């Protein structure tokens, strides 16, 4: 079944025969028996092909090679035995192969390597021995053959490298030793490797820095990442000045010598992370071909003023997670395309810091203490796409030089109350601003080939043009405010001014009138604010919510509502007491206590942070999750509570059953107030539950409709459905006529 290519090359992989194929041409020069099921090669198995030149025995469960089996293969050059079950390197089986160039013995379960092994292999060039179970480096077999050029010993159980282990491999070029359990390296373990150009020590147990690598003058690639090493001392690479790449990541490092990375002329990258005991910039004299630089998580507070003028080919510069507070002048470097200064202590950006960086594309200044940026800091800076100054304390932001900026991030700068004109950022695609009102003028109706995405959204609780919204909601709010104000004033004047004796019920009615008047004053505040800023509210919300006016409006609203509810409960208690059968002074004291409680409830959100500024309505019931959950849940809890106690009380006298009249007035008051409180509580609770989805515009409209409505309604009922008021009005008219 062997597939013959006809070019003196034979393929026999995978057809499952357990012996050497027979009947093959005598002139063949390549033969493949991989994937087969050959376990042992009998004596003189390959004597039929004296012209063989490449042989592959991989995948076979082969675990024995006769000493004379591979004899007579003088012209063989490549021999692979990978994946097999050879328990030891075959010493007295490859002895006669005097013209072999490459030998694979990797992925076998090799435990021991006979000392006499590898004798006579005067033409070997590459050796594979990785993924084996060798406990120590075989010194004699390696010393046997001096012509080796590549060697790998990875994925093994070697723990220490003895002195002069590789003394005689003068021609070695590549040495792999990664994925091992090496933790101790002798001072002379790497002697004689004059031509070595690649050393791999990754994934080991090294804790102290290897002193041996000082004897590798031709080193070009060195890797020791994912080790235990912590200290890299000065003179680490002094003996190997041809280094190009060094891999040292995934290593817990504390201190790196100041002269560790000097005189490496062709080193092109440098990444150091976690070296927490470093406090000064490395001596980089002699290192001029650096393309990248990454010093992260250290205590460096300065950057050399000659870094830009030395590294001509610098392309990336990462200096985050340090204590850098003063920046040098970057004008020297032209190829620099990314700069990261994230999470540092920089407090100022001057116009000279970024002058002349003609190729800078990405700039990061997130999470620093910058409070002043020069107006022309980015003026002559070249074509930049990404800018990031998030989580600083910025008061103003420059405009010139940022027209071709695709991305901008300004979040976290709560003092940045200005507005960014969309004329400057004609090509911006993604924006982040501290306040949602700043992105209103930017995206317009989008949030004409704009596709501009702004991080803080304006979901009708941060209005762009009109605060109240549709015309009908503006008219009804205006009407509510007018009627509430006028009728509350009229009720107060009739009840209090024209009187000589104040019964408890009448005084309570007057107090509810006062609270409703305060609610109406809040509604008038809202109406005038909307009217003044009509179609331009995006220029007002930042000043409104983060100002004293919103605090005033929120306090007025909360105080009026709480006072009305508490006075409604006190009236329900007095009605019960009057129906039971002086205490008028006691009830006056109780009314003062209720007023004080309403005042303290209103004042409470002032010291707490993040409630009165949630919405331009200055209410503690905004859209979405309430930032101060506790305050809102308490307020609604104790409101529904007092509602249920007065409901229970009036149920009690209903069961129990002039003075008999006017009780229905208080009943209607409790009816209207409770049925108007339910929607506000329901739509404050709704955003907490993810099951119910409510459009924010409808929520805001209904809140604006029903929050102040009881203030509009109560004096209407007192003024039209109570003969008590008609008598008071007659008395007032009689007093006026006098």
């Amino acid at each position, epitope marked *: 079944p062997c597939s013959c290519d006809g070019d003196r090359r034979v393929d026999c992989s995978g057809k499952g025969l357990t012996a050497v194929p027979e009947g093959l041409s005598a002139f063949t020069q390549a033969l493949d028996i991989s994937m087969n099921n050959i376990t042992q090669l009998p004596e003189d198995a390959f004597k039929n092909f004296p012209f063989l030149e490449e042989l592959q025995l991989a995948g076979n469960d082969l*675990s024995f090679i*006769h*000493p004379k089996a591979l004899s007579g293969l003088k012209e063989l050059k490549v021999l692979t035995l990978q994946n097999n079950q050879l328990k*030891t390197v075959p010493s007295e089986a490859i002895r006669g192969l005097s013209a072999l160039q490459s030998l694979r013995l990797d992925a076998n379960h090799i435990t021991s390597v006979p*000392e*006499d*092994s590898f004798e006579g292999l005067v033409q070997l060039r590459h050796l594979w021995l990785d993924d084996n179970s060798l406990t120590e480096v075989p010194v004699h077999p390696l010393s046997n053959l001096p012509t080796l050029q590549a060697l790998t010993l990875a994925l093994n159980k070697i723990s220490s490298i003895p002195d002069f282990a590789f003394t005689n491999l003068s021609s070695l070029v590549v040495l792999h030793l990664h994925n091992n359990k090496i933790r101790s390296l002798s001072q002379h373990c790497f002697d004689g490797l004059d031509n070595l150009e690649t050393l791999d020590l990754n994934y080991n147990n090294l804790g102290e820095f290897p002193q041996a690598i000082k004897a590798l003058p031709s080193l070009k690639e060195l890797g020791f990442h994912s080790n235990s090493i912590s200290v890299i001392p000065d003179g680490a690479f002094d003996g190997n000045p041809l280094l190009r790449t060094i891999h040292l990541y995934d290593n817990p490092l504390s201190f790196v010598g100041n002269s560790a990375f000097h005189n490496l002329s062709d080193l092109h990258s440098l990444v150091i992370r976690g070296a927490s005991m470093v406090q000064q910039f490395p001596n980089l004299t002699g290192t001029v071909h650096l393309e990248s630089l990454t010093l992260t998580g250290t205590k460096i507070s300065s950057i050399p003023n000659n870094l830009c003028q030395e590294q001509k080919m610098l392309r990336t510069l990462d200096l985050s997670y340090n204590n850098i507070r003063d920046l040098p002048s970057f004008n020297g470097c032209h190829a620099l395309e990314e700069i990261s200064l994230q999470r540092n202590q920089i407090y100022q950006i001057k116009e000279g810091t970024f002058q002349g960086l003609i190729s800078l594309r990405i700039l990061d200044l997130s999470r620093n203490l910058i409070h002043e940026i020069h107006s022309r800091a980015f003026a002559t800076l070249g074509p930049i796409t990404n800018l990031d100054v998030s989580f600083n304390e910025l008061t103003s932001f420059p405009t010139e030089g940022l027209n071709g900026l695709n991305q901008l991030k300004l979040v976290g700068n709560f003092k940045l109350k200005e507005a960014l004109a969309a004329k400057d950022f004609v090509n911006l695609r993604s924006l982040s601003v501290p306040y949602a009102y700043q992105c209103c003028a930017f995206w317009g109706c989008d949030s004409s080939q704009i596709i501009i995405h702004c991080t803080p959204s304006t979901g009708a609780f941060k209005p762009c043009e009109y605060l109240l919204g549709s015309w009908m909601i503006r008219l009804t709010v205006w009407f509510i405010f007018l009627v509430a104000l006028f009728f509350n004033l009229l009720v107060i004047l009739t009840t209090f001014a024209s009187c000589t004796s104040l019964p408890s019920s009448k005084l309570f009615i007057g107090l509810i009138s006062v609270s409703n008047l305060f609610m109406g004053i809040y509604t008038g505040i809202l109406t005038f604010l909307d009217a003044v800023s009509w179609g331009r509210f995006a220029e007002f919300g930042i000043w409104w919510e983060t100002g004293s006016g919103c605090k005033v409006a929120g306090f007025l609203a909360v105080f009026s509502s709480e006072s009305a509810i508490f006075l409604l409960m006190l009236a329900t208690v007095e009605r019960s007491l009057s129906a039971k059968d002086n205490h008028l002074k006691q009830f006056r004291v109780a009314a003062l206590l209720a007023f004080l409680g309403a005042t303290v409830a209103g004042c409470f959100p002032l010291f707490h942070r993040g409630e009165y500024s949630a919405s331009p309505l200055c209410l503690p019931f905004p859209t979405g999750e309430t930032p101060s959950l506790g305050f809102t849940v308490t307020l609604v809890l104790l409101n529904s509570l007092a509602f249920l106690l007065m409901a229970v009380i009036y149920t009690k006298l209903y069961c129990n059953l002039s003075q008999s009249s006017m009780i229905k007035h208080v009943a209607w008051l409790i009816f209207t107030n409770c049925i108007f409180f339910c929607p506000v509580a329901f739509f404050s609770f709704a955003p907490l539950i993810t099951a119910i989805s409510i459009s924010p515009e409808i929520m805001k409209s209904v809140t604006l409709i029903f929050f102040p409505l009881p203030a509009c309604l109560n004096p209407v009922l007192y003024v039209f459905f109570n003969p008590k008021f008609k008598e008071d009005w007659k008395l007032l008219k009689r007093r006026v006529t006098k």
Partner: nanobody
Amino acid sequence: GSLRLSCAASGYTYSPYCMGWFRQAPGKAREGVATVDLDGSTIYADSVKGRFTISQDNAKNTLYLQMNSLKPEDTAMYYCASRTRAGVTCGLNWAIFSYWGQGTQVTVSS
């Protein structure tokens, strides 16, 4: 029971260096049951002491191995291996020995 396993030198004497006896299970690796080095030094594996003994002699250059305490699991393909190129140290693996015999197969009895 007990049985005699004798392996002799076909040509030039093989006693000048280490000679041993190996056993191979059907289809897997040859494993070494015993070995003897010049000067009479002998090495046995884990399941060999007390039930297998080996001795050379250079009088007529021949190895011999008394086997006893017969167990069912200890039935395999037995070979005698030799090495006369000197150097190195004696061992228990197959790779070291330069010469190999055709071997004898014995089945456990009683």
